Symmetry: C4
Subunit: 93 residues, 4 copies
């Protein structure tokens, strides 16, 4: 419980940072910077944008190595400690 | 057995939702909306399309966090509890 | 040992199938069809091509669910049962 | 500790190799070759570039199978043995 809360806050902050950077350095709209941050950390990849500035490319490299771990951690616990029980409870005859 | 069935149905529903949304909000053909939903949740990424509407971008963000977990769960059990035995049985001298 | 060999052959066959399909249905060169098959199953994603035919889009969907599992299995054992020992042996004072 | 150091050096070398290849064979700038190497091994995918030469496509295929394992290994230990403790220490009442 408190674990998922911590991972949630950590993820929120990680995304906020991405939103602020890509909207300031790469000139994206707040919503687009968020989207790029999300698809990047989850490794989906954005097909409509790639960092154009060397500053953006360097940041993304570091942003990736530092973000993917905690992002998938959240996704992990989000599924295991939240998504799993809900479906099991719905099954119970 | 019953586990893979549950994960299969859950995945089917998850994809159906994606197909309906992207074909209604993003104006994709049913088959293309399905494809985008699949390549997104499996993190492959679609190189020929990205949500153009802010509504589409927001949904995708949430769709990703909620879908990736169960999708890879299915892929996991699909491989372990289905793909693995089949190949082992084929090996048996 | 024999495990990595099995996973290797399985992966080879999986890629061969992809190479033959994408070069026949999507009209790609043999090398490009292979590349697309590789970047898709490893979830990297191809930024220069997406299936144009409905036949190609349907196949890719199934190809993804069936391929990712064994591909990452190979990558897993390739790293653990092959890449890991080699680096450890190189460390030994 | 010494484990993360080994995985770090291994990753650095893996990326250096990618940077040198893509800047020599694919004619990318050093920073862009590095970026492509990073987004590829982490499976994010690059939406602004794909190998144009058959030499580049073949190398990438092998580069992927050999790199993803150690890259995610680093990301794994980077998160578990470095990122995890730091956040836990920050929590302690
Ligand atoms: K990707
Ligand atoms: K892509
Ligand atoms: K991926
Ligand atoms: K991608
Ligand atoms: K493109």
């Amino acid at each position: 419980d408190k674990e998922f809360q911590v991972l949630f806050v950590l993820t929120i902050l990680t995304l906020i940072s991405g939103t602020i950077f890509y909207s300031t350095v790469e000139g994206l709209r707040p919503i687009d910077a968020l989207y790029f941050s999300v698809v990047t950390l989850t490794t989906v990849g954005y097909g409509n944008f790639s960092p154009q500035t060397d500053f953006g490319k360097i940041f993304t490299i570091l942003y990736i190595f530092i973000g993917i771990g905690l992002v998938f951690g959240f996704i992990h616990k989000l599924a295991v400690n939240v998504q799993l029980p809900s479906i099991l409870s719905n099954l119970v005859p």
